[PDB]
Enzyme design. Structure first.
Site, PDB file in Angstrom:
ATOM      1  N   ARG A  35       0.845  -1.197   0.000  1.00 15.51           N
ATOM      2  CA  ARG A  35       0.000   0.000   0.000  1.00 15.51           C
ATOM      3  C   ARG A  35       0.888   1.257   0.000  1.00 15.51           C
ATOM      4  O   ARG A  35       0.599   2.216  -0.712  1.00 15.51           O
ATOM      5  CB  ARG A  35      -0.984  -0.026   1.177  1.00 15.51           C
ATOM      6  CG  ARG A  35      -1.854   1.220   1.279  1.00 15.51           C
ATOM      7  CD  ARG A  35      -3.065   1.051   2.172  1.00 15.51           C
ATOM      8  NE  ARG A  35      -4.102   0.206   1.587  1.00 15.51           N
ATOM      9  CZ  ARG A  35      -5.021   0.615   0.716  1.00 15.51           C
ATOM     10  NH1 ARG A  35      -4.986   1.853   0.253  1.00 15.51           N
ATOM     11  NH2 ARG A  35      -5.976  -0.220   0.328  1.00 15.51           N
ATOM     12  N   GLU A  71      -9.739   6.157   6.729  1.00 13.67           N
ATOM     13  CA  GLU A  71      -8.269   6.263   6.630  1.00 13.67           C
ATOM     14  C   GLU A  71      -7.817   7.459   5.795  1.00 13.67           C
ATOM     15  O   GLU A  71      -6.841   8.120   6.150  1.00 13.67           O
ATOM     16  CB  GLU A  71      -7.663   5.005   6.009  1.00 13.67           C
ATOM     17  CG  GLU A  71      -7.842   3.762   6.864  1.00 13.67           C
ATOM     18  CD  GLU A  71      -7.406   2.480   6.183  1.00 13.67           C
ATOM     19  OE1 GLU A  71      -8.042   2.075   5.171  1.00 13.67           O
ATOM     20  OE2 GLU A  71      -6.402   1.919   6.630  1.00 13.67           O
TER      21      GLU A  71
HETATM   22  O1  LIG Z   1      -5.484  -2.526   1.935  1.00 15.14           O
HETATM   23  C1  LIG Z   1      -5.680  -2.728   3.166  1.00 15.14           C
HETATM   24  N1  LIG Z   1      -5.703  -4.003   3.658  1.00 15.14           N
HETATM   25  C2  LIG Z   1      -5.921  -4.241   4.975  1.00 15.14           C
HETATM   26  O2  LIG Z   1      -5.955  -5.404   5.475  1.00 15.14           O
HETATM   27  C3  LIG Z   1      -6.114  -3.073   5.866  1.00 15.14           C
HETATM   28  N2  LIG Z   1      -6.315  -2.896   7.179  1.00 15.14           N
HETATM   29  C4  LIG Z   1      -6.401  -1.567   7.366  1.00 15.14           C
HETATM   30  O3  LIG Z   1      -6.601  -1.043   8.536  1.00 15.14           O
HETATM   31  N3  LIG Z   1      -6.270  -0.834   6.250  1.00 15.14           N
HETATM   32  C5  LIG Z   1      -6.071  -1.725   5.252  1.00 15.14           C
HETATM   33  N4  LIG Z   1      -5.853  -1.637   3.941  1.00 15.14           N
END
Ligand SMILES: O=c1[nH]c(=O)c2[nH]c(=O)[nH]c2[nH]1
Ligand SMILES: Cc1cc2nc3c(=O)[nH]c(=O)nc-3n(C[C@H](O)[C@H](O)[C@H](O)COP(=O)(O)OP(=O)(O)OC[C@H]3O[C@@H](n4cnc5c(N)ncnc54)[C@H](O)[C@@H]3O)c2cc1C
Ligand SMILES: NC(=O)c1ccc[n+]([C@@H]2O[C@H](COP(=O)([O-])OP(=O)(O)OC[C@H]3O[C@@H](n4cnc5c(N)ncnc54)[C@H](O)[C@@H]3O)[C@@H](O)[C@H]2O)c1
Ligand code: FES
Ligand code: FES
Lengths: 481, 49, 99, 98, 464, 99, 98
Positions: free
Chosen positions: A41, A422
């Site tokens: 990410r 987020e």
């Molecule tokens: O792409 C993600 N996967 C996850 O497992 C996760 N867990 C999280 O809090 N944000 C994200 N983002």
């Protein structure tokens, strides 16, 4: 996860970035957990908001004798993006051009491909940016900052406007699924459950809202009691900001099924009340119970071919923050923050404004206050609020302004909404770079070259701010001169 | 037993979870050789409870 | 059901029932029931939040109101810490009838 | 400004968001600022969080035992002092995993 | 006696076998089943456990109300007080306006901190029914929330001071007359002389001492007896450093440890006076007396601005801070730099020392003898041409542990800018509160000018 | 019926939104649910009835189980505390009726 | 379940319907929040009614597993199931009969 980054950016005298190479390293601790997806990410967001024709990012996850690091709201995105914004800050400074112009001209446009080749459709970031510019009165306040700084030797102000792009969907595609189960009892009351869990984000509130629209009954007739593996099995974690997206669909589908089964009884009595349709259905022996399910379509990225869409859509927002540092102590005030956030057609603007502020203040802690210390032999010293300093009541911007972008429906999520948990967290980086701006000005005040790229690691704590405000006192204490 | 704590201890000891992850697009050697300015650096970002 | 462990704060209930087949309830005296160690309360029709009408054809009382209509008509319920204490308290509910 | 004791102006907060279409039903709450459904209960301390659930009268308490070393061999474990504590029941280790 | 008697939400509690180790939070939750009060840290920093104490103050013939951290309050300290938890002020059937407004203004997300914040706000309003925006923010120095980002809590509560997310016009108004009565039984009981109490637990005996004679006899017989007043230090030593004091004496009831005496040289506070009382007393004096006389008072008040929050300062004693002798005490540098007069008694001895560097010989030690206790501290008036500043820098401005903390004093030869005295004292620069004893003497007789600034800075750079 | 397990209900109040969970020896969870709901004046979606197994029913726990269930639900609602009642054989035989 | 062996029978039914051993199927309890609006266990009917319900619930699952069964006709139940999960196919279903 703590990150170490090694970066080299190449750019024109206009500030246009033409080459970027970043090696990332995370401290994963003593089990793998989510460490690899987090690093993915991070790599997915090393561009933050900027189009870079020639670009290479690497990530490696360190295996260490520390407690295993895990997911934290942002999930590697914030680390990825701070790095982006760190070198970007240095490009603007090296170029002698304003930060906000250098960022704007390097920004993606509608239809661009990311470094991972996903197309940005419904690109509202330029609108977030222009609205935040005008609503924050950014240019005017830049001059007011300039002025304060001429008039004050031992306090300095800084102002920075930062954008963000944040991809929505688990990086592991099959986690992008959810389920609901709905019962209508014979008094007309509805019991609903879904795979999502409630942790303060107001998910149950949003799903009751969704179900109430779907069924066309008041929210007062629908209840959620709990989440349970024996009512909805095989649920993804409540994570990746996506839980309203996944469960909302799930809930909606369960509700559609119940409607389909009630439609003969509706047709027979189109005025007669909900309670009558239900009892009529019951005494005609029609099932008043249904499951619902949804999977996010068409996801799946390949690192090998650099193709496939990892995300269903992106969140966009912009924050302008102003700070006033005390150059003699490292203390600072957060004077004002202005945020423009695209949450599509919000399911619940009270809750979404709540999440923007909550996310932002956690990010504010990440980048300025919150610090973990270990012995050299790897024992966490920081084990409570006495030593671990999260944002207090007194920490938040004195003037705190949040706008949800108008007239931006997002087709492909529940009732045109977008995920919100987020994406806003990174926007607190605007306080970090405002602090960096103020430090520069404090350094200029003691005859420091103003294309000088001094170090500011995160978090930018009083320690780091004070030590970077080089003066006759730091010089005496370090040097002996 | 020998401990590996920091990111640098781990790099030193080749202690990783799995292999390098990478994304690259375009032509880096060209991009860099054609730019007016080159700026390199390192950043550390602390964790969070 | 009764094999399920008790919660630390769990209370016991004991039904108090008509000893006359048909009769008006003249009065109810809980004075002895209150002296029993552990006694919490005596529930009657008045304590019912909403409806005292129950049963499959809505023709039954949750608790007797004004008249009892069988020996074993449920009049009230004692609540106490333990079953022993609920039973003893239940014996201290004196009821006066008019047949 | 160096001598000034710490002082803050008072807060000035603005929250902007879009009104729903005026043809939308008052019962349709999607896009409206409906308070978190548990807000009142959460203000009143009536909302139940895991440790708020009453204990069963036969309920036991667990406490994890953790390493004080970053990397080491476990040479031995001595529970002799643990066993003297009133109400001690057992120490679970790897060998108890079924 | 051995029975512990107090009130919770108006209801009498009689505990026949109080264990000194039992905190109020554990008693509320596990003995009374009232789980509105939460455990968030056990350390005093998070406020999730905040409740209100009400009591009859015998020294003022009035009823007082303050907040405490229940996680750090020994039930054995609470004989004849009245506790108010979140369940005590309202429920969903009848929400207290504090409850209504935090709910309706979107100031509760995960909800775990909400009872704590509600009780801080409630306590404010019982003390000041019309607070200023400033007093409201200050009510929450000891309250953390991880979810909301704080704005809506403050915004919702701002209604109590002096297209939209909520409608304040729909909020029910507050009638202070409708708050719970002070238990008349506690006013009936304030007519009886306090007797010494003894509580015996599994590992710990607690003596609640009624008089100075009882306290001093006990310390003479049993010098290992550990004084406990606010428990804001001893609570942490027990819970976290696993230290065990098998014998505790709590002297909080003793009048002479609670007194406030105006004298020619300054103000004497009994050792057990809470910081909140030091605050309230010094604030009055500052507001009325001339600036010239209140330089040290303002020093102390500045340090107390950033000293935890309301919960800790309500029970934290002035004496407790001094004897703890933490290297990072925020008050000891100020007391040292002003040479505050301390009175030390035992059975059969009384002496005074001006706080100087000798008061703290080593790590967490003072010059008190085992059988002595600190009776009082005199915080001095400043004289003509005497100036004082206090400083603190931590990682966070509010409710933090100091990295470096300081008190600084200069006295000038009258009518001059020439130094007669100079005292520069620091926490966080050694294993004890120190004086820059090497740097400051060579400045005596010097004028307050650039040359002095340079001499001291170089002196401090070498000395520290 | 002389089911060897007499009628028994445990009612557990949840403290929120009128939520209650009952553990009952009954053949009729639905009517148990409905009758408790109406007696309390809360919607059905608040009431959960759970049956693991019964030590006999034979029709005697098709409806008459609810006279215990409702009394107990009420006690639990009122006190905020779990409440339990298992009938003694003499009680069960008198109150609940037969063929 | 009141001793008449209803759960035993429904496990027998589900086992035949899904073509898996009874060992892999469990019934823990009866609950108003898993199946709503249930008729009493009475009129000797309960195996007939619930048996059909169970049957239909199993038919829905089988219909969802079909494509994974076609791709791997011999590979075991566990493989089909994990395949359906990782292809994001629901593995929960209601069934009903009148
Ligand atoms: O792409 C993600 N996967 C996850 O497992 C996760 N867990 C999280 O809090 N944000 C994200 N983002
Ligand atoms: C959340 C939190 C935040 C805090 N923040 C700060 C801060 O910002 N700055 C700071 O300096 N401190 C801080 N403290 C430390 C603590 O609050 C103070 O030291 C407090 O003043 C101790 O007072 P007390 O009455 O609780 O002492 P207790 O814990 O009751 O006792 C402390 C010590 O003093 C002794 N003692 C008490 N009275 C006497 C007496 N009359 N004679 C002899 N010995 C005596 C006791 O025996 C014990 O050894 C904080 C503590 C907490 C829990
Ligand atoms: O109560 P404590 O021991 O928890 O206080 C520790 C703090 O005191 C200071 N400190 C303690 N010992 C020291 C020493 N030997 N040298 C310098 N500073 C010290 C530091 O500021 C440290 O943060
Ligand atoms: S639980 Fe955090 S201060 Fe008491
Ligand atoms: S709302 Fe979660 S900590 Fe305050």
């Amino acid at each position: 996860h703590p990150f170490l980054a090694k970066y080299k950016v190449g750019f024109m005298k206009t500030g246009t970035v033409v080459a970027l190479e970043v090696a990332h390293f995370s401290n994963g601790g003593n089990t793998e957990d989510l460490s690899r997806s987090i690093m993915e990410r991070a790599l997915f967001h090393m561009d933050n908001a900027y189009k870079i024709p020639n670009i290479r990012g690497t990530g490696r996850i360190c295996k260490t004798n520390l407690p295993s690091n895990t997911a934290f709201r942002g999930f590697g995105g914030p680390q990825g993006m701070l790095i982006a914004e760190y070198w970007m800050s240095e490009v603007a400074i090296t170029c002698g051009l304003p930060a906000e112009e250098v960022r704007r001209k390097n920004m993606y446009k509608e239809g661009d491909l990311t470094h991972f080749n996903q197309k940005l459709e419904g690109f509202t970031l330029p609108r977030c940016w222009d609205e935040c510019i005008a609503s924050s009165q950014y240019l005017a306040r830049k001059r007011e900052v300039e002025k304060f700084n001429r008039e004050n030797c031992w306090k300095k102000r800084g102002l920075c406007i930062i954008p963000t792009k944040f991809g929505i969907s688990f990086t592991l595609p099959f986690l992008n699924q959810g389920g609901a189960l709905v019962h209508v009892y014979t008094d007309g009351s509805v019991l609903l459950t879904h795979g999502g869990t409630e942790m303060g984000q107001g998910l149950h509130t949003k799903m009751v809202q969704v179900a109430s629209r779907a069924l066309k009954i008041p929210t007062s007739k629908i209840h959620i009691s709990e989440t349970s593996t024996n009512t909805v099995p095989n649920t993804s974690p409540t994570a990746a900001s996506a839980s309203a997206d996944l469960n909302g669909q799930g809930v909606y589908e369960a509700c559609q099924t119940i409607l389909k089964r009630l439609e003969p009884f509706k047709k027979k009595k189109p005025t007669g009340p909900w309670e009558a349709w239900v009892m009529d259905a019951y005494t005609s022996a029609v099932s008043l119970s249904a499951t619902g399910f949804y999977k996010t379509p068409n996801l799946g990225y390949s690192f090998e071919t650099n193709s496939g869409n990892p995300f269903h859509y992106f969140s966009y927002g912009v924050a302008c923050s102003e700070v006033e540092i005390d150059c003699l102590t490292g203390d600072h005030k957060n004077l004002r923050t202005d945020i423009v956030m695209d949450v599509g057609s919000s399911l619940n603007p009270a809750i979404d404004i709540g999440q923007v502020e909550g996310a932002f203040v956690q990010g504010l802690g990440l980048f300025t206050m919150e610090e973990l210390h270990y012995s050299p032999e790897g024992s966490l010293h920081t084990r409570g609020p006495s030593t671990y300093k999260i944002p207090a009541f007194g920490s938040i911007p004195i003037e705190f302004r949040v706008s949800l972008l108008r007239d931006c429906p997002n087709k492909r999520a529940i009732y045109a909404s977008k995920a919100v948990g987020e994406p806003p967290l990174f926007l607190a980086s605007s306080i970090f770079f405002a602090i960096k701006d103020a430090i520069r000005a404090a350094r200029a005040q003691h005859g420091d070259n103003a294309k000088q790229l001094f170090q500011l690691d995160s978090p930018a704590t009083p320690e780091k701010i004070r030590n970077a405000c080089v003066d006759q006192f730091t010089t005496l204490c370090v040097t002996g001169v | 037993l020998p401990a590996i704590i920091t990111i640098q201890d781990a790099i030193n000891n080749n202690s990783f979870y799995g292999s390098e992850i990478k994304i690259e697009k375009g032509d880096l050697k060209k991009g860099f050789s054609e730019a007016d300015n080159v700026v390199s650096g390192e950043l550390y970002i602390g964790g969070q409870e | 059901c009764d094999d399920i462990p008790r919660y630390e704060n769990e209370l016991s209930l004991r039904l108090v029932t008509s000893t006359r087949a048909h009769a008006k309830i003249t009065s109810i005296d809980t004075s002895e029931a209150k002296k029993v160690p552990g006694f919490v309360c005596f529930l009657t029709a008045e304590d019912v939040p909403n409806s005292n009408a129950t049963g499959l054809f809505n023709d039954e009382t949750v608790f007797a109101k004004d008249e009892v209509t069988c020996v074993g008509h449920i009049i009230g319920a004692v609540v106490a810490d333990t079953p022993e204490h609920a039973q003893r308290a239940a014996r201290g509910v004196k009821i006066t009838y008019e047949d | 400004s160096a001598t000034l004791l710490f002082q803050k102006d008072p807060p000035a907060n603005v929250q902007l968001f879009q009104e729903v279409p005026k043809d939308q039903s008052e019962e349709d709450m999607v896009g409206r600022p409906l308070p978190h459904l548990a807000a009142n209960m959460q203000a009143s301390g009536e909302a139940v969080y895991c440790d708020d659930i009453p204990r069963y009268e036969n309920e036991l308490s667990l406490r994890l035992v953790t390493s004080t070393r970053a990397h080491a061999k476990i040479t031995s474990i001595d529970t002799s002092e643990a066993k003297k504590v009133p109400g001690f029941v057992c120490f679970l280790t790897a060998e108890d995993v079924p | 006696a051995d029975e512990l008697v107090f009130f919770v939400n108006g209801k009498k509690v009689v505990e026949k076998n109080a264990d000194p180790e039992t905190t109020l939070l554990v008693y509320l939750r596990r003995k009374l089943g009232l789980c509105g009060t939460k455990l968030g840290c056990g350390e005093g920093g998070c406020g999730a456990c905040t409740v209100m104490i009400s009591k009859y103050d015998r020294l003022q013939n009035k009823i007082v109300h303050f907040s405490v951290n229940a996680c750090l309050a020994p039930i054995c300290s609470l004989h004849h007080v009245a506790v108010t938890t979140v369940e005590g002020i309202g429920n969903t059937q009848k929400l207290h306006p504090v409850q209504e407004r935090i709910a309706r203004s979107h100031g509760s997300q995960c909800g775990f901190c909400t009872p704590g914040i509600v009780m801080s706000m409630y306590t404010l309003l019982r003390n000041q029914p019309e607070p200023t925006v400033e007093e409201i923010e200050n009510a929450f120095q000891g309250n953390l929330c991880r979810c909301t980002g704080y704005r809506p809590i403050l915004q919702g509560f701002r209604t109590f001071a002096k297209p939209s997310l909520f409608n304040p016009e729909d909020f029910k108004p507050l009638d202070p007359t409708q708050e719970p009565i002070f238990p008349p039984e506690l006013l009936r009981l304030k007519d009886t002389p306090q007797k010494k109490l003894r509580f015996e637990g599994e590992r710990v005996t607690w003596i609640q001492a009624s008089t100075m004679e009882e306290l001093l006899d006990l310390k003479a017989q049993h010098p290992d007896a550990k004084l406990v007043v606010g428990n804001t230090e001893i609570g942490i030593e027990m819970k976290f450093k696993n230290m065990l004091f098998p014998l505790i004496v709590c002297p909080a009831w003793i009048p002479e440890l609670n007194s406030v005496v105006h004298g020619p040289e300054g103000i004497s506070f009994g050792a057990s006076c809470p910081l909140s009382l030091v605050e309230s007393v010094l604030a009055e004096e500052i507001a009325k007396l001339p600036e010239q006389k209140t330089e040290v008072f303002r020093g102390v008040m500045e340090q107390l601005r950033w000293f935890a929050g309301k919960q800790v300062k309500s029970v934290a004693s002035i004496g407790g801070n001094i004897i703890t002798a933490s290297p990072i005490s925020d008050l000891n540098p100020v007391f040292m730099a002003s040479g505050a007069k301390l009175t030390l008694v035992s059975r059969g001895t009384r002496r005074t020392v001006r706080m100087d560097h000798t008061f703290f010989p080593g790590y967490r030690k003072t010059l008190l003898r085992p059988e002595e206790i600190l009776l009082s501290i005199e915080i001095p008036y400043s004289k003509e041409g005497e100036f004082f500043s206090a400083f603190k820098q931590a990682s966070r401005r509010e409710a933090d542990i100091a990295k470096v903390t300081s008190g600084m004093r200069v006295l000038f030869k009258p009518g001059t800018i020439e130094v007669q005295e100079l005292s520069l004292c620091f926490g966080g620069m050694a294993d004890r509160t120190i004086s820059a004893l090497k740097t400051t003497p060579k400045q005596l007789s010097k004028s307050w000018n650039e040359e002095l600034l340079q001499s001291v800075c170089a002196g401090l750079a070498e000395e520290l | 019926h002389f089911y060897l397990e007499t009628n028994c209900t445990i009612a557990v109040p949840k403290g929120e939104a009128g939520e209650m969970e009952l553990f009952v020896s009954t053949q009729n969870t639905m009517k148990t649910q409905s009758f408790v709901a109406k007696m309390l004046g809360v919607p059905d979606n608040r009431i959960v009835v759970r049956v693991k197994r019964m030590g006999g029913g034979f029709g005697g726990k098709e409806t008459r189980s609810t006279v215990v269930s409702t009394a107990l639900a009420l006690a639990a609602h009122k006190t905020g505390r779990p409440v339990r009642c298992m009938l003694d054989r003499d009680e069960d035989m008198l109150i609940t009726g037969g063929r």
